[PDB]
Amino acid sequence: SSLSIEARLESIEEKLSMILGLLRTL
Amino acid sequence: LSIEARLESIEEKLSMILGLLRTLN
Amino acid sequence: LSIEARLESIEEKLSMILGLLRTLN
Amino acid sequence: SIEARLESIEEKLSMILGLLRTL
């Protein structure tokens, strides 16, 4: 926390992309 | 690179994950 | 339309994913 | 509450991540 909304959101999005990449291998 | 643009993309990803998960064997 | 509206929707999707992920185990 | 929403979202993500590893 204390990283701002813009930077905090970047990570959420990059974490979701990882999950999608991993899921698409099934 | 906009809060609105970033959020839309996030929403898309979540729905995609849900769609992929519903089909999970 | 509106950050708060999307954020609520995003939160709802995350909860759904959690339930499913817990269900798969 | 926005700053509060993000914290809640961030916490759901952690569980999801952990659960993926449990797969």
Numbering used by the authors:
A (entry chain G): 168 to 193
B (entry chain F), C (entry chain E): 170 to 194
D (entry chain H): 171 to 193
What does the paper say about this structure?
Diffraction data were phased by molecular replacement using residues 169 to 194 from Pcore, revealing a tetrameric α-helical arrangement consistent with the modeled structure. The asymmetric unit contains 2 tetramers, with a solvent content of 40%. Since the asymmetric unit could not physically contain 2 tetramers with residues 158-237 (with 1 tetramer present the solvent content is 16%), packing considerations suggest that degradation necessarily occurred prior to crystallization. The residues 158-168 and 195-237 are absent from the structure, in line with the flexibility observed for these regions by MDS and SAXS-based ensemble optimization. Additional stability is provided by a solvent-exposed network of ionic interactions created by Glu173/Glu177 and Arg175, or Glu180 and Lys182 side chains from neighbouring protomers. Comparison with representative models from the SAXS optimized ensembles, as well as with the best scoring models from MDS demonstrates Cα RMSDs ranging from 0.9 to 1.6 Å over aligned residues, confirming the accuracy of the modeled Pcore. The structural data presented here indicates that the α-helical tetramerization domain of HMPV P (residues 171-194) is considerably shorter than the highly conserved central region of the molecule (residues 158-237). Interestingly, the sequence of Pcore aligns with a region of RSV P that is necessary for coimmunoprecipitation of the L protein, suggesting either direct binding to L or the requirement of a tetrameric P protein for efficient P-L association. The short tetrameric coiled coil from HMPV P clusters in a separate branch from SeV/MuV/MeV and RV/VSV, emphasizing the pertinence of its classification as a separate subfamily, Pneumovirinae.
For all paramyxoviruses, the nucleoprotein (N) encapsidates viral RNA, leading to a N-RNA complex which, together with the RNA-dependent RNA polymerase (L) and the phosphoprotein (P), forms the viral replication complex. The P protein is thought to be responsible for the recruitment of the large polymerase L onto the viral N-RNA template through direct interactions with N and L. In addition, P chaperones the nascent N, which is sequestered in the form of an RNA-free NP complex. For all members of the Paramyxoviridae family, the P protein is an intrinsically disordered polypeptide which forms tetramers through a central α-helical coiled-coil region. The analysis predicts the presence of a central, highly conserved region with α-helical propensity located between residues 158 to 237, which we refer to as Pced.
